Amino acid sequence: ASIMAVTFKDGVILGADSRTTTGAYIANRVTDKLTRVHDKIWCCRSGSAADTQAIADIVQYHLELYTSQYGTPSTETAASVFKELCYENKDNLTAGIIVAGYDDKNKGEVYTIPLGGSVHKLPYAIAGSGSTFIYGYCDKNFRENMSKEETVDFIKHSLSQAIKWDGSSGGVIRMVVLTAAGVERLIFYPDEYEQL
């Protein structure tokens, strides 16, 4: 795939392409790689669609139940439930996931779970097949505490590149903005992100 998540002044923003390929064939060119495990805790999926789907499905539950009993879940916790699944099942999974969410205390929080099952908290994180090409662009163009539209742009560019250079990435660019004021889903089309 080709996915990333960025934090800022007002919260966190998730971004992804929409291209799941089996082989050289684009089996679906409109994939929703931004998946929701709670009001304001979402993930970015990459790796086996069957594996990332199954996991997020199983985390959506653990957290619906955690809410039932114990209350609203820290973004930190969502991450721990992901790691526990990915690590304790490493031998049989191929999934790299980015968990991102907004609470009121910390605001923007982002956790990247590589293949191993390790967990790494970061200001922003990139992953998925086409990430390799933007480690350069991102490290140079990222800043802390960006404005909302500053961050949308940072993501639009980063992902415009990843898709240019990756054959396993493409489609439309989906975003999901997570702030106090709510959940806003974004979409940018090819006629737009290519001309950058």
């Binding site: 499905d57 199983i58 959506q60 539950y61 619906e64 139940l65 039932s68 009993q69």
Partner: protein, 243 residues
């Protein structure tokens, strides 16, 4: 010998002694509850009794949030209520995961009544001394109110009441659906349906309530939530300024 009084087996007249007793336990708390349907809401009022000045009212609740959509209010000893609520909070999370839609009020009830039934047929486990009143605004049926009892029975009510002065409250409601000849309370905003539920309970119990003697649960589409200390005082203030 005379030990068909101690386990869930048949007395000589086809009676389950242990279940009949289990019912008698649901009053042991001495709280009364009622539930109503709106044009598109559902409301449950329960009493809150905090005798010990050492208690923290905020932790004293017989109203449980089972899911996003589904609320439950129990008449019965606290320990048993929680044993049931925890099991429902989990039968409904499992239901969503396995089957792909939120768990519907009447299905959760059939599943707890089925459970409540096993207790009624197995020697070694005892029923619970609780009467679970389930509410929601289920996406197919509308406002729902389904009640299960230690007997294993469940059924759906226009409105209902449970506990010690159950029949005084019940007979008040009966005489107000004999009179509007419908299956609900024709008011739009849930606020007026909460006021109505408190009104017809003051009327039936012959005592006034303060913001501290009541617990209110409410179900609209897409949410079930409980009213805070103050969210009730507002409801009471409005009753008093028309009555």
């Amino acid at each position: 010998a005379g030990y068909d009084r101690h386990i869930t087996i048949f007395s000589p007249e086809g009676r389950l002694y242990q279940v009949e007793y289990a019912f008698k336990a649901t009053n042991q708390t001495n709280i009364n509850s009622l539930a109503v349907r709106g044009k598109d809401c559902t409301v449950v009022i329960s009493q809150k009794k905090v005798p010990d000045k050492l208690l923290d009212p905020t932790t004293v609740s017989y109203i449980f949030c089972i899911s996003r959509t589904i609320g439950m209010v129990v008449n019965g000893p606290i320990p048993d209520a929680r044993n049931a609520a925890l099991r429902a909070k989990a039968e409904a999370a499992e239901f969503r995961y396995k089957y792909g839609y939120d768990m519907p009020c009447d299905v959760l009830a059939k599943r707890m009544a089925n459970l409540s039934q096993i207790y009624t047929q197995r020697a070694y486990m005892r029923p619970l001394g609780v009467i679970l009143t389930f509410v929601s605004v289920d996406e197919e049926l509308g406002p729902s109110i389904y009640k299960t009892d230690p007997a294993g029975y469940y059924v759906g009510y226009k409105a209902t009441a449970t506990g010690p002065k159950q029949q005084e409250i019940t007979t008040n409601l009966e005489n107000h659906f004999k009179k509007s000849k419908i299956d609900h309370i024709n008011e739009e905003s849930w606020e007026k349906v909460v006021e109505f539920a408190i009104t017809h309970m003051i009327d039936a119990l012959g005592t006034e309530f303060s913001k501290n003697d009541l617990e209110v649960g409410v179900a609209t589409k897409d949410k079930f939530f409980t009213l805070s200390a103050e969210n009730i005082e507002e409801r009471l203030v409005a009753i008093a300024e028309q009555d």
